[PDB]
Design a protein around this nucleic acid. Structure first.
Ligand code: MG
Ligand code: MG
Ligand code: MG
Ligand code: MG
Ligand code: MG
Ligand code: MG
Ligand code: MG
Ligand code: MG
Ligand code: MG
Ligand code: MG
Ligand code: MG
Ligand code: MG
Ligand code: MG
Ligand code: MG
Ligand code: MG
Ligand code: MG
Ligand code: MG
Ligand code: MG
Ligand code: MG
Ligand code: MG
Ligand code: MG
Ligand code: MG
Lengths: 142, 120, 110, 56, 103, 117
RNA sequence: GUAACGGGGCUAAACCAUGCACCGAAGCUGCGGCAGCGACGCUUAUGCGUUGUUGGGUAGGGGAGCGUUCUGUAAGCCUGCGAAGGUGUGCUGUGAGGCAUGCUGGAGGUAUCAGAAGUGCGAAUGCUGACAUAAGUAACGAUAAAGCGGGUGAAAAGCCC
RNA sequence: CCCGGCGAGGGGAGUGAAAAAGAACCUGAAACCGUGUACGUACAAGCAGUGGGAGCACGCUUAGGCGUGUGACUGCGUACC
């Protein structure tokens, strides 16, 4: 007999809301990447996106510990001459604060097509209200 | 060329005389045990005619046989040269391979005496 | 009815001929002839002669009415290659392949 | 200047993909002679835009 | 109602009337077999094993056929060391139809 | 005597190319390359017949851990509860149950809780 | 080009000490099967019932097999109601392989048991024949120069006037 | 008999048991090159497989699905001598 494998035309996905008022970054993106990959559903399948859709708001109000507001540096390279660009945490807060959540989740998610496809289910916003009320989102508590 | 070319080689083995004679003793004993051996006094015909020879083999109910003689008859050898399933030989000129190959073997009684003297 | 015509041992490369054949594969006969007529290449000349041969063979040996006729199958296989010596510099020589083609055109009505 | 591996059928298709012929399919019909020709080009019968030249 | 049991060193969940491939058994073709080492029986209300081997639980089954499985290849190969082997294998199976479930 | 080799060579080559249908290019067409990739396919077959067991077991354990945390307990405490409840149900069947019949799994969790505390 | 945890990331997800769980390999166990070596009884390793044990492996030693060509068995057997070879499929054994058959082919092949080998190819910048590759790329052979009307001709920048 | 240039080559007729035996000629493998159908591929990287596996198209039926062709996605994974 053959053990169950999830089928992408049968997948029942749901929608959730995460308040990010004052939460811890790594410990939050933990639960986020978990719910996006589908490690919480009993019908998990490693090659089928079996997670859910998550809307995280107040992404500007994430907390980190220590001097990571000052000393933790995000680096990226262009591909050019000496094109290494660095930015601190509060520089990312001032520039585009959703990038912190998005890069942390993308790092926790796998590399490749299924990782990017389940990363597509992550919607983050800096404010407190949003334009996605039509999907009947249920509050996630964490 | 060929990597190791061939030469005209003699395939003649060496046969021990006692091994040869014991093989012939055993081969005739096994012919008797297979009941493939018949002994009569006289076997000849006084005309060189394969018609007469084939009629005599029909009267003896014989198909693929081996004739052996005490001494050799002109007309008897002439009547079975042209017959493929039948060879006619002198009692000296024998081979175990044709002793096997032919379905039954018939022997002159004088040839039986010469064979048993020749084996001893 | 499918009607076959072909040209063996044409003195041109099948690579060059399939460039012409890919224009008129599947089209009608009249537009096919017009495209070959106003297409400016050696293989177009050759396949125009082959296609006119196909037209005539279809008209003559079997079912007529050219007006109800479409270009259906066309394929250009490669043929044998004539192997010549070309003298290059410093005493050496190189093989030369005068590549040929088998041009086959099958024409039918429906 | 020479290669180090042998290229493929697939690479040969990817290179010859654009080396493919574009027909004209835009022919024009002369009013007078009642035949067709290339646009701005003359007929074999000395006609162009209705009027007449050599027609040898 | 469905049943979970132990047959060939491999546990199996099954419903009533289902055909299950198993390991080789010494039993004949048309002989009826039973299993009293059942682990789970379920309905709207279920009975699991607390300690194993359900009290009233029994599975009646019928052997349908015996056979040999799909052949698989074994290739062994040491690169640069001048050694390779190959073997072939088919695993013996018995097919059963599960007739009866009882508790 | 002199023996020619064509028929038996063609048989062996044809057998290997039969085993190498569906491969990319010279892997399907050329003996000197197909004979390598079939042996490598044998290596990977000999490896992955083992690795099916690891990969399916970690799939099963993932689904059991997910459904156990749905019913409010961890995988470790759940397996410990089954071993102290003397339960010998394996992870294949538990995964199939935790997919299909949730309530049976919930009752197994409650038995593991009662065996734990 | 961050670049001194693999990474994301962590004030515990780090460190010292303690406990109970869990994961985790081709190790161990469970099932089913093969072979070798013993050790056993009917019986003679022909085998059968267990039971113990072993089974990574280069150079290399030993033991057992398959398949091809030819000779005897073969003036026998198969074959024009279709042989060898070629291409597919299905079945079979641990293995080299075998068996039945469709299509092609159009006249030879050979069971069983023995016998003799030019007896099994991926490699040696191996030899011969064929076929791709760069690729429709470079070049088309002194930079002394060509232009037009007519003719032949299926069609002419080159041929003729 | 027809097309084509009084060609090369071809389609019919026809001989023949056979023309896919038509003079490059018995059989006609492989490399290589085409044509048609089915499936996949245009946000996705690496000895191109293997293992799992969704979907698509056919062939079977005891009609549960066993079979073939394809292989979205995923774990592992650096040819041979
Ligand atoms: Mg990874
Ligand atoms: Mg092929
Ligand atoms: Mg454990
Ligand atoms: Mg294991
Ligand atoms: Mg083991
Ligand atoms: Mg065992
Ligand atoms: Mg060994
Ligand atoms: Mg022969
Ligand atoms: Mg060289
Ligand atoms: Mg060479
Ligand atoms: Mg050019
Ligand atoms: Mg170039
Ligand atoms: Mg150039
Ligand atoms: Mg140039
Ligand atoms: Mg010049
Ligand atoms: Mg002049
Ligand atoms: Mg002619
Ligand atoms: Mg030829
Ligand atoms: Mg021929
Ligand atoms: Mg895409
Ligand atoms: Mg990898
Ligand atoms: Mg070698």
């Amino acid at each position: 007999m053959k053990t169950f494998t999830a089928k992408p035309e049968t997948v029942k996905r749901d929608w959730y809301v995460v308040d990010a008022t004052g939460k811890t970054l790594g410990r939050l993106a933990t639960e986020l990447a978990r719910r996006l990959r589908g490690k919480h559903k009993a019908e998990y399948t490693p090659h089928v996106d079996t997670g859910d859709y998550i809307i995280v708001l107040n992404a500007d109000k994430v907390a980190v510990t220590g001097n990571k507001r000052t000393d933790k540096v995000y680096y990226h390279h262009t591909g050019h001459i000496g094109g290494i660009k660095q930015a601190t945490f509060e520089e990312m807060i001032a520039r585009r604060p959703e990038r912190v959540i998005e890069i942390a989740v993308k790092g926790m998610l796998p590399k490749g097509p299924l990782g990017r496809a389940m990363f597509r289910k992550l919607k983050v916003y800096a404010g407190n209200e949003h334009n996605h009320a039509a999907q009947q989102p249920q509050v996630l508590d964490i | 060329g060929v990597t190791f070319a061939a030469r005209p080689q003699d395939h003649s083995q060496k046969v021990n005389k006692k091994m040869y004679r014991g093989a012939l003793k055993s081969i005739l004993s096994e012919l008797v045990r297979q009941d493939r051996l018949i002994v009569v006094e006289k076997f000849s015909v006084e005309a060189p005619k394969t018609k007469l020879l084939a009629q005599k083999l029909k009267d003896m109910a014989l198909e693929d046989v081996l004739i052996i003689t005490g001494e050799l008859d002109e007309n008897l050898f002439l009547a079975a040269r042209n017959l493929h399933k039948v060879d006619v030989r002198d009692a000296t000129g024998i081979d175990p391979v044709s002793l096997i190959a032919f379905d039954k073997v018939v022997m002159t009684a004088d040839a039986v005496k010469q064979v048993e003297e020749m084996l001893a | 009815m499918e009607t076959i015509a072909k040209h063996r041992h044409a003195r041109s490369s099948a690579q060059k001929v399939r460039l012409v054949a890919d224009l008129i594969r599947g089209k009608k006969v009249s537009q096919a002839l017009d495209i070959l007529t106003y297409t400016n290449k050696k293989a177009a000349v050759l396949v125009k002669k082959v296609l006119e041969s196909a037209i005539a063979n279809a008209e003559h040996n079997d079912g007529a009415d050219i007006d109800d006729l479409k270009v259906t199958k066309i394929f250009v296989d490669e043929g044998p290659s004539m192997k010549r010596i070309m003298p290059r510099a410093k005493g050496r020589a190189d093989r030369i392949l005068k590549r040929t083609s088998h041009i086959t055109v099958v024409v039918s009505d429906r | 200047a020479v290669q180090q591996n042998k290229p493929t059928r697939s690479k040969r298709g990817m290179r010859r993909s654009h080396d493919a012929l574009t027909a004209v399919t835009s022919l024009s019909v002369d009013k007078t002679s009642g035949e067709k020709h290339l646009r701005h080009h003359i007929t074999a019968d000395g006609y162009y835009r209705g009027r007449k030249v050599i027609a040898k | 109602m469905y049943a979970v049991f132990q047959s060939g060193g491999k546990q199996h969940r099954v419903s009533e009337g289902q055909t299950v491939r198993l390991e080789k058994l010494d039993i004949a073709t048309g002989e009826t077999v039973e299993f009293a080492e059942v682990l789970m029986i379920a309905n709207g209300e279920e009975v699991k094993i607390g300690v194993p081997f359900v009290d009233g639980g029994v599975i009646k089954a019928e052997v349908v056929a015996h056979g040999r499985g799909e052949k698989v290849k074994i290739v062994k190969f040491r690169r640069r060391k001048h050694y390779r082997k190959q073997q072939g294998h088919r695993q013996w199976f018995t097919d059963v139809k599960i007739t009866g479930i009882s508790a | 005597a002199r023996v020619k080799r064509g028929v038996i060579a063609r048989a062996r080559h044809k057998k290997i190319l039969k085993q190498a249908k569906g491969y990319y290019g010279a892997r399907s067409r050329v003996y000197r390359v197909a004979f390598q990739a079939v042996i490598k396919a044998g290596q990977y077959a000999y490896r992955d017949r083992r690795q099916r067991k690891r990969q399916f077991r970690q799939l099963w354990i993932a689904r059991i851990n997910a459904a156990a945390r749905q019913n409010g307990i961890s995988y470790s405490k759940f397996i410990n509860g089954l071993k102290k409840a003397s339960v010998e149900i394996d992870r294949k069947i538990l995964a199939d149950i935790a997919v299909f019949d949730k309530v049976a799994f919930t009752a197994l969790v409650e038995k593991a809780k009662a065996a734990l505390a």
